[PDB]
Amino acid sequence: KAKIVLVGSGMIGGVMATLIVQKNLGDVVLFDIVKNMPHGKALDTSHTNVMAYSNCKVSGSNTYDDLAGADVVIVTAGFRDDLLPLNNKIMIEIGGHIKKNCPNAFIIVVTNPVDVMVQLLHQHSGVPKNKIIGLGGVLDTSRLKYYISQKLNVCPRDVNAHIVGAHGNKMVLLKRYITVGGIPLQEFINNKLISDAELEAIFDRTVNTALEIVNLHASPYVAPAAAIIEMAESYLKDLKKVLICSTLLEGQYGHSDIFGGTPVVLGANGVEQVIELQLNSEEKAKFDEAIAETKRMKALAH
Amino acid sequence: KAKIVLVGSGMIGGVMATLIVQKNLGDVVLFDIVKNMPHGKALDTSHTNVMAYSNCKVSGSNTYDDLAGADVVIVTAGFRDDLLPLNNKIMIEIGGHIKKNCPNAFIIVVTNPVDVMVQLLHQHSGVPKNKIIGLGGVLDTSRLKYYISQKLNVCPRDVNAHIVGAHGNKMVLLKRYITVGGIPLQEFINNKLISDAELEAIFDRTVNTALEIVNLHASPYVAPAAAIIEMAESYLKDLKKVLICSTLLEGQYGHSDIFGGTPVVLGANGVEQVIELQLNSEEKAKFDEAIAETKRMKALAH
Amino acid sequence: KAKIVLVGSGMIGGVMATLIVQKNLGDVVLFDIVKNMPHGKALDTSHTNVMAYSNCKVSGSNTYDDLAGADVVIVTAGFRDDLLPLNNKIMIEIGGHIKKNCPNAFIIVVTNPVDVMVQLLHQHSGVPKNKIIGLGGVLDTSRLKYYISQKLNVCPRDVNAHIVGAHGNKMVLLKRYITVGGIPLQEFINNKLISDAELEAIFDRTVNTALEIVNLHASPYVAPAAAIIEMAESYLKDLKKVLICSTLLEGQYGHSDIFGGTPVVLGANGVEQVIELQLNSEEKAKFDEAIAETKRMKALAH
Amino acid sequence: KAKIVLVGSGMIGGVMATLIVQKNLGDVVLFDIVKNMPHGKALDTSHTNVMAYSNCKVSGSNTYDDLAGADVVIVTAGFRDDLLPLNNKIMIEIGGHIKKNCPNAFIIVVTNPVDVMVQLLHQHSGVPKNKIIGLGGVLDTSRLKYYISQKLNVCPRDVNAHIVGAHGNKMVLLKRYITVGGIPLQEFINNKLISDAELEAIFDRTVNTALEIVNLHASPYVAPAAAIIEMAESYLKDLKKVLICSTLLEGQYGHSDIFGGTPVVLGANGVEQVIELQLNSEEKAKFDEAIAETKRMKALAH
Ligand SMILES: NC(=O)C1=CN([C@@H]2O[C@H](COP(=O)(O)OP(=O)(O)OC[C@H]3O[C@@H](n4cnc5c(N)ncnc54)[C@H](O)[C@@H]3O)[C@@H](O)[C@H]2O)C=CC1
Ligand SMILES: NC(=O)C1=CN([C@@H]2O[C@H](COP(=O)(O)OP(=O)(O)OC[C@H]3O[C@@H](n4cnc5c(N)ncnc54)[C@H](O)[C@@H]3O)[C@@H](O)[C@H]2O)C=CC1
Ligand SMILES: NC(=O)C1=CN([C@@H]2O[C@H](COP(=O)(O)OP(=O)(O)OC[C@H]3O[C@@H](n4cnc5c(N)ncnc54)[C@H](O)[C@@H]3O)[C@@H](O)[C@H]2O)C=CC1
Ligand SMILES: NC(=O)C1=CN([C@@H]2O[C@H](COP(=O)(O)OP(=O)(O)OC[C@H]3O[C@@H](n4cnc5c(N)ncnc54)[C@H](O)[C@@H]3O)[C@@H](O)[C@H]2O)C=CC1
């Protein structure tokens, strides 16, 4: 079986462990710096193997060397711009341990701001560029897809959409790349099934969804976890899904030496393909704004 | 639980019963005119409830009144243009029994030529237009999607495509409506990841797939069954999937008083939406050719 | 689709909503008395329909009349013996609203001490005895089954076991009723694959598991949620699983007028069968101790 | 991904390929000696990746060297006692190719009489004893479990039962080892929920089920396929299920140098445990009769 190490056993970590057992995806280590909490979560979660018909070990850890043997490492560890150097130090520490203990693992970074943190961990861990990605577009687009599906009264997964550049407030929502059952969304607009003004409000809701959830006295963690597991599952099972993730750009969109959100194909070799959308000049200008903000924050991270 | 009656317990019927138990979708009746064969298939299939963790009854029947209580009726019963009046007589007979025993059932017609047979059964059963559809586009597009996915090395379901008008040799393969991970296929052509000539060969392979399978000394029945169950499941579970099926046209594409293939939304109310693609004049001319052939065959069916 | 109302949107409520969407079981209402928190959790969870390929609405509520239309109601609402009258008052309030708004719903009670609270809600809601059960044995036995499976290196679900009488410290762990792959556990003891002393330590661990998790700075909520969803799913899908739950006793084990834990069969009619284990006199004496403690606490609840 | 080679692409082979794609278990090769038929079945089945959300290659083969790289090999190839030397010759041929091309594969033998054929293939292939098993008990017990579940109105999987010794007419149906929800069946008999006479009729039905299906003008192949896939899945996913299979006996039950049916644990190391039921002297005498018949037939196979 695969060994999946969750570096960070907080809110997202707990849901990931739950879903991994539900899906029987592999053995799980809940790693954290907080003493014994991961052992407690692991114990609770382990019992769900019975209900789920699964056979995944779930263990807790406070010991970095339990990274040894990991096939997948998912980094949610962390805790304004003031946090950037603190979370950088966490990425440095984790990277040194990945390099030593599991240099061949597939790495998914979640810690915000993710497009910065994923590149910092790439640098500190030394893993190949096809073996480390960041969460962003699967989550952001799940929101956009879902909101459109409820307006159009269709199955949520039948809406497809692209959000690129970065996770966070500069995300680029590409109206031209929305489809419903594979059909351009513009046909539905033309038929007055959804209006341009409705879509503008949905776009703004998508950008502000994390804030909306926080203002309702909750935290966004279940959908982030589910998005991460969709990514990890595509790797583990060699599904070769097209999923939008933060990945190293090497000239796509006119950008290099930086990570940003774009469709990729995830399978057994990691990032098997980086797909470059054929953006028009106006869309590219928005992409550039997203990259500029990643670069601004990266400079502050040290 | 739902009661699903398979009117026709041949090759497609057997796989449908298998998949219904796998998915725990409902109780199954394998109905046929052949004596005892459906009882034998039902007995074999019923044991798979243990392996599948399901609880679906599977029974055989030679008695039409076992249609009573059906929530879903799937018609594969049947056996050149010479067959048209013989299969019409089968649709007449089945329709009379549906009208009497299960007028509120959701009906899926499979018997070829499906766009003719579905309308004949609509007429003979009296069910509402939102409660009867024919298999076509889910199956035809599964082939197109699959062949493209193997060229592009992506997950099969991540290719979406539209084939409309009719099932059979006049099916309309809409190049403009192919996407990969929600991205227009033309971007992949522009990047020389797949060529126009490759796609032409894939289109011809799609049209001729049933013949290809027969020439390899096999029969097309597993994918037809899986396509039908995808449709039935969307109804039973109120998924509201966008699925291309044969449905009554009431002016879409300039056509009325005939069934043809188009995207529809399938949920608990049956056909909840008929989606009309905004075809251009050249695509519409191909659609017209498909309808004309359905009409030609319908006239021969009596 | 089914409508599932989670009366209580805390830790267990959140995981239940997650699992319901994963399993596409029905629309979900997260109801709570805390303002807006359920709306926030509902919003986060709703996005997972995309990742899960599901179509379940997830809404929050602070309005009791949203119980109207519920097919299943799961009660986790609540917050030593000092709490008994406070949680009784919560059961009274919920019961009045169930009686008015959804008297035909299937009710699962979770609030501790569950064997007391389930009967109080039965009394206050007026629902039939086959339509209300309490969580206990599925959860307690998941722990016992799991711990044994890890010693014997077998699939967790292949261990079966019975814990009866009550949830909590007087639970009756029935050594005679443990099997592995359907084989009596005693054969494995005879073969020195597990010893009697190992099993004694596992029994004590099972009884004290909730305390163990709390002492590790965690809370038991994921496995409780999964156990509840196994119960709810058996009802919704008419699986007729044998599951140990708290149910009204009408003479079984020599007890009436009280709820206690025993195997039941859960299907579309609710509790379709109450199974009475043929306990020996010594096992019965332990059962009596469990009932006595439920009665002691019920008297304090008012 | 795993590579699963189906040596034999007939009735059972076709269903296995269908189920492997449904479960996304691995790439599939349909191998047969019949020209092109496996290619045709493979082509049909491959399209179901779209409906199933899977990514399994399905190919046909007439070339034995396509065994190279196989992780799992499932042998259904074959076609009274007169057939024994003909099917032996098929096992010899297959064994030579396994030894050359995939000596590290996990092998499941199905060809009848399975307890003879599995040992012949063990001998001819040279694989280790923990890496080759025969289908029998999962299938025979699925029938027994199912029939009892329908009498008792419980979920089929909640009945557990043991049938040992051999597949075929000398199978040993162990009344003492039947449970319902983990409870001895005798408690249900004592409660007059099922009688001893009913169980005798169910036992006879179980022994004669293949004949019953054939006499109904059908063939037993769907449940055999599902049983085989349950076994293969337990290996591939390291589930460590307890499953009754034909395996090499090394003194269990007083028998050596022969294969017979007994519970085993199947996981990533193949047969991880052989479980010896603690049979009484009368049960052992029936076990001996089953082994004697395997030995009689093996002698005739050459
Ligand atoms: N990329 C995206 O789309 C999203 C990113 N996020 C980010 O994900 C991160 C995690 O979010 P939650 O799980 O909700 O937070 P959380 O606060 O519940 O969990 C973070 C955990 O990291 C642990 N931690 C701190 N230093 C560590 C170290 N060196 N090694 C291991 N563990 C360590 C903490 O003790 C804590 O348990 C945050 O940075 C958040 O902003 C959240 C949602 C979406
Ligand atoms: N719409 C589509 O995309 C496709 C349609 N088809 C069509 O589906 C149909 C079924 O195909 P298979 O299952 O492979 O054929 P099959 O020949 O195996 O099964 C047809 C069954 O219908 C039964 N039957 C005849 N009259 C009947 C009656 N009055 N009531 C009930 N059963 C009756 C037969 O005895 C036979 O068992 C054929 O018409 C075939 O051309 C096949 C593949 C795809
Ligand atoms: N039966 C069993 O096996 C188990 C029972 N439990 C019990 O389950 C209950 C819930 O546990 P958690 O979810 O972890 O607790 P929690 O404290 O996270 O959630 C309880 C929720 O109930 C809400 N609430 C209070 N009064 C309410 C009302 N009138 N209507 C609706 N909501 C109301 C609270 O605001 C809170 O959000 C507790 O009583 C706990 O002891 C926990 C585990 C196992
Ligand atoms: N162990 C058990 O519980 C059960 C065993 N069986 C046995 O399973 C076997 C298969 O049954 P079905 O699939 O229904 O039969 P089938 O006749 O449909 O398929 C057998 C296939 O083996 C092929 N074959 C013959 N020689 C071959 C070779 N050297 N290499 C590869 N393929 C070759 C044939 O061409 C045919 O396609 C039979 O021996 C049957 O008695 C069937 C049911 C249960």
UniProtKB/TrEMBL annotation, chains A, B, C, D:
<dbReference type="InterPro" id="IPR036291">
    <property type="entry name" value="NAD(P)-bd_dom_sf"/>
</dbReference>
<keyword id="KW-0479">Metal-binding</keyword>
<dbReference type="InterPro" id="IPR011275">
    <property type="entry name" value="Malate_DH_type3"/>
</dbReference>
<dbReference type="InterPro" id="IPR001557">
    <property type="entry name" value="L-lactate/malate_DH"/>
</dbReference>
<dbReference type="Pfam" id="PF00056">
    <property type="entry name" value="Ldh_1_N"/>
</dbReference>
<comment type="subunit">
    <text>Homotetramer.</text>
</comment>
<dbReference type="InterPro" id="IPR001236">
    <property type="entry name" value="Lactate/malate_DH_N"/>
</dbReference>
<protein>
    <recommendedName>
        <fullName>L-lactate dehydrogenase</fullName>
        <ecNumber>1.1.1.27</ecNumber>
    </recommendedName>
</protein>
<feature type="binding site">
    <location>
        <position position="32"/>
    </location>
    <ligand>
        <name>NAD(+)</name>
    </ligand>
</feature>
<feature type="binding site">
    <location>
        <position position="112"/>
    </location>
    <ligand>
        <name>Ca(2+)</name>
    </ligand>
</feature>
<feature type="binding site">
    <location>
        <begin position="110"/>
        <end position="112"/>
    </location>
    <ligand>
        <name>NAD(+)</name>
    </ligand>
</feature>
<dbReference type="GO" id="GO:0046872">
    <property type="term" value="F:metal ion binding"/>
</dbReference>
<dbReference type="Pfam" id="PF02866">
    <property type="entry name" value="Ldh_1_C"/>
</dbReference>
<dbReference type="GO" id="GO:0006089">
    <property type="term" value="P:lactate metabolic process"/>
</dbReference>
<dbReference type="InterPro" id="IPR022383">
    <property type="entry name" value="Lactate/malate_DH_C"/>
</dbReference>
<feature type="binding site">
    <location>
        <begin position="8"/>
        <end position="13"/>
    </location>
    <ligand>
        <name>NAD(+)</name>
    </ligand>
</feature>
<keyword id="KW-0670">Pyruvate</keyword>
<keyword id="KW-0106">Calcium</keyword>
<comment type="similarity">
    <text>Belongs to the LDH/MDH superfamily. LDH family.</text>
</comment>
<feature type="domain" description="Lactate/malate dehydrogenase N-terminal">
    <location>
        <begin position="3"/>
        <end position="134"/>
    </location>
</feature>
<dbReference type="GO" id="GO:0004459">
    <property type="term" value="F:L-lactate dehydrogenase (NAD+) activity"/>
</dbReference>
<feature type="domain" description="Lactate/malate dehydrogenase C-terminal">
    <location>
        <begin position="139"/>
        <end position="295"/>
    </location>
</feature>
<dbReference type="InterPro" id="IPR015955">
    <property type="entry name" value="Lactate_DH/Glyco_Ohase_4_C"/>
</dbReference>
<keyword id="KW-0520">NAD</keyword>
<comment type="pathway">
    <text>Fermentation; pyruvate fermentation to lactate; (S)-lactate from pyruvate: step 1/1.</text>
</comment>
<keyword id="KW-0560">Oxidoreductase</keyword>
<feature type="active site" description="Proton acceptor">
    <location>
        <position position="167"/>
    </location>
</feature>
<feature type="binding site">
    <location>
        <position position="87"/>
    </location>
    <ligand>
        <name>NAD(+)</name>
    </ligand>
</feature>
